[PDB]
């Protein structure tokens, strides 16, 4: 059937009876009223059974051996479905497929019933999920810590071409993977005031909110290691939240519990709301108590060995309060002197930066911290004081450098620069792509780099080959395994061996066959769940990621309209057929992004119903783009669009997902695109547009969009089409904000890359016309994507930051 | 060990491995970190396993055979713990006791970890729970329908002698007995308006709240019948509750979900709050859709057979909206003519009245119904119109009778008398005790009784012998079974056979021994969990029920202070030692009731620390009185206090609980007290005080408390002690509200029954001094309590109201 494992005689039989056990005893149903949803749950419970045994020994093991523990703090964990991924990592896929088949059920049909765990916005949240899988696979004693939102990223609905948001009640039917642990509930404090008495400060008169943990298992790839992802849920105490109308007192509990109610749906954007700050401290305060408790047990109160036993990784600045919180505990509660406490804190903390755009930077108003976390503000001022004293001593008289490096920003309202806080309290700061890391040193954190050059590093992102290959593209994984075996699943570098089959006639035919099968399946799914046909013979041109101005979905739109206009000019001229698919969610308050989604659908309305165009060009907007949808489109894509303005996309990861699944990449020299082209050879990549230096040259000069409008008739024609209502008949001025922006305030110079972009697009169309060569280029990309596995990234974090050695050693059976 | 069943070899072994299965796979724990709470859950899950098989066949059976279905609607279900009760009804107690013993655990210690299901206030909610158990035991296709409050009756804490309320988070650790059924979620409407179009009215523009069901199994006594208790939970739709700030929209969902958040803690008191009205319609609207769906399937759309297949019992007026709601559905949706719809509604509905005190009567302001349920108000006006037309036609010219019987009350604000609505739309109205039922006919509902005498009936309350005897008093159940067998557990009348052992020397010794063992165990529990000693040789004088003015805990207080004053007058005179225990919760807004609790504790402060008193008199306030606590005190009581003012306690059930457990009763000729004395012989009962007629004579005359104050020096002395601060030194005027009330506005004439009350108390003290005779009187009470089993009550409801025949037939195994 494939290498989804063995369908053993004894195990298929065992599986079937447990499936029936759960359907009866757990679901309390009888075959005669059981629905597909019930069947999915019976299976989910049966599969979950297989890793509890391993889960218990893994955790017990870490308690015995007592290795250094890695704590990955993140406010987001974009997990997606977990049934199939668990079967894969446990080598249960074929056995379950068989058993369910014998029970007369279609496993694939049941897998589709599982709700996605959308506790993330995009890249940042998904990185965390891939990292967890890799840390488990590399046998690291790692813990994922976050918030258990009852509402994840909203579900996107398109109504009249506009995005409509609706609550993601992912817990509605229950979550068979999590295990509530009410017995480990912890208290978290808010507000109050600070008392300075005799021997130390005291945080007093605080409001208490309880943090209840929920553990979810994270199985490594076939090594019997099952790590833990602990997610905190807010609960109100039953005393003061009643003890300070009786009915009203009880109804008001849903005020303390609102803290873990919903994920903020902003991607690369900072909103200084108090509820967000509360979520950030909540996850930090609860998590740290757990970290210290575990340490106090260990084999040990000298906190001198704390950094030898603990490592906490900050996924962006969101969990940055962990620095002043670790100090508070050590100094206020444990009574360590400042200097000793600081040494410990810096040595256990490490920070990961994800972007350089200003609007994404967390700068919290002081009055907010002042009211909500009074003691933390005091600690931050003191950290700032001592840090600046270090700067002055290093750069005597550099008074401007002092104000520039301050953790405290003066002005309208004083704010705290969380990024500066993280650099100061961490022993390592890293970028997520080579170019992004360099930019950090040359620009944004230049002053900090000059002060402590040893702190700055790079750790190029990666994706897990398990979910992003074996799981979503079994067909491709099979033919690869037929030639080079299976060891590449946990050693992606081995994909290089595929280079020697680049001229192999059978392989070329096979690689091309699986991609064709994937396109047919997706084209079907399209009509199944969304309804309105596409042509599987055309080039699948797809751009899927969050809707942003910097990601330039607009630049993609300009190209689409150009293709359309050229066809209408010479209708009877042959052009390579294309189905361009654009998908992604816009943050609710991002007006421009929502305007762009309307533009996309507007273009599709015109293009898809023009008889002269026929099946040569289709514009489709992929609704509710999420992890589970990504697992479907990516394996079916031919062309991957990664066209952000050079210098704006820190790294990106979707690009990597496409490269590993047989799609060619048209993109700019941005983020990881650079290392990908470098790995496959620029000749097997479609690079275009300005490089970072060109962007800066243009900025010195000054960007004037009119110029491009004046010199390019094709561009001019498009803008006048938008301006006159060609794409919005009933509301002619509908897109005035887009045009206005493009012409007068384009921060991402869309027009500057237009000419080179369509020119480059012509080159891919030329290559698509030559199936054999297109496929050979594909093989060159796949065979060379090994570097982008999160196992490599994690192995680097482990050795260069955490001080731990990865291990591919199978844990002593289950 | 006892007749808790057989401890079979194969079954104890089977139990142990499943206990271990759940501890590992369900709880995900290992013996080395498992706590008693974990062990309780492993056992609970193991026991729950045994009734799912029976639960599924029972429900499947009803679907095949299709018998008349009984729907018991109640806003309260005071269930208490359910582990032991399930073992008992399944004959698993000894096997589980053995198995757990072999696993090295104490079953009793684990049973104490289970949280009470306190979804009730007192009598009304407990009646519903006892009824469910009896209906299951008598093999009726019955369903309990209510609301799944996440916060039940508050937990009472005494701070400085005052009651402190605190949220009852009974779901904190989970509920292993319930089964969420999200797939059967139903929509419920609120607000909106009414459109009258061509062919009928339409309820439009309504706000939708979803009702999610949770099923809990109700096992019959050893007959393999497991009925269902369906509890609705409020959930917000994910569309409009977002689709009409994005964050705020999501946080505001906890507005529609507040409907099932908390139980109103009022006992026999009406509060016209909108949230209450919402809870009442919510349970009614959701439940009826389920009833009709089930009917539409049946073996059948002629609703003529609806009453032959359905019976809905209204537990008080709380679910009264079921009448106009059934009409709305039949007329508005099914399109039946009014008259046909009304005939059907009246024939399937039946109403149970629980009290005659005005302050407990539900009279909803019209403006509230007008805004929240516009169509229901219209239907109620139309029902009223046609009903009054019936009255006028029966009593021509009786214009006053017309206004008196109206469902609509004029005045300050127009209101709807829910009780009148229930009488009009039901084919049977019943009281809960013979005297209460007569009073209804002679007083409160006299006009209605004259109009349709056939509607009025009586159904004397009862209690379940399983939980209220076998479960809480295994020692007594054992010695009874030793002489007459076990058939009495489901045939309590057989207790009469115990009359022939009334002179048996061994039995007298045994009955007295178990009571002594029960007192020792309770006296221990007291020091264990609450701490401060009592003497197990004294008379256990206990009054446990909700704190009320009509229940006269105050009359009990007067007696306690009298005993104290007599001892202080003649210290060296012998008096029978007593431990008087008073317990019960006061509704949060009931000032007087909270004042009474403070008085009780105040008396105990003086009495319990007076050296001259010694161990001859102890005053104890039983904290957090609830079902699980009742199962502890009652079996240990010698004297049961049921001293309400004649005519105010509809029936009472605690009185019955005490009679069955070997306690003697000192009470007034009120509620069921009358039938109890009638059953045991007034010579074996301590009756005192005014009878109903005496109370009325006094009212004609006019009640003047001064008189009693003037003629009784002992009474006078007590009042002056309260007035001068003898019981409240630091705050001398603390009890001025109690004294003021007692002297000027005592609606329950406490002083009128004082003299006869202490005189009667002297008689019980005299009898207690004669152990042999006290015990013989006890045997006369127990042997004669058979009539008060809920099996008798249910059998009567079944035959005289529902039209179904009970059956003690074992369902075809599990
Ligand atoms: O005091 C202890 N005795 C024995 N095992 C322990 C003890 N504390 C932790 N463990 C084991 O270590 C695992 C780790 O628990 P943690 O504290 O959540 O990391 C537990 O599930 C147990 O198997
Ligand atoms: O359409 C049907 N086919 C077969 N069994 C049914 C069907 N509807 C109900 N049942 C059975 O009847 C039980 C009663 O379900 P209820 O609708 O919740 O009362 C179900 O659990 C099934 O065993
Ligand atoms: C991988 C992934 C992302 C990140 O994509 P980029 O193109 O790097 O912005 C976002 N969303 C989902 C659902 C993903 O799978
Ligand atoms: C039986 C019971 C009641 C009813 O007692 P009465 O004396 O009839 O008022 C109230 N509360 C609980 C906990 C009960 O067990
Ligand atoms: C101006 N703006 C927003 O207003 C915004 C956003 N992301 C979310 N929002 C609300 N981004 C990226 C942005 O540039
Ligand atoms: C006056 N009053 C109340 O105010 C009250 C009550 N029960 C609850 N409350 C709040 N009762 C029985 C009562 O008589």
UniProtKB/Swiss-Prot annotation, chains A, B:
Site features described as Can be labeled by an AMP analog, chain residue numbers: 143
Residue(s) carrying Phosphoserine: 2, 406, 490, 723-724
Catalytic reaction(s) noted: [(1->4)-alpha-D-glucosyl](n) + phosphate = [(1->4)-alpha-D-glucosyl](n-1) + alpha-D-glucose 1-phosphate
Cofactor (UniProt): pyridoxal 5'-phosphate
Bridged cysteine pairs (disulfide): none
Role noted for this protein: Allosteric enzyme that catalyzes the rate-limiting step in glycogen catabolism, the phosphorolytic cleavage of glycogen to produce glucose-1-phosphate, and plays a central role in maintaining cellular and organismal glucose homeostasis.
Family the entry assigns: Belongs to the glycogen phosphorylase family.
Protein name: Glycogen phosphorylase, muscle form
Organism for this UniProt entry: Oryctolagus cuniculus
Designated gene of the protein: PYGM
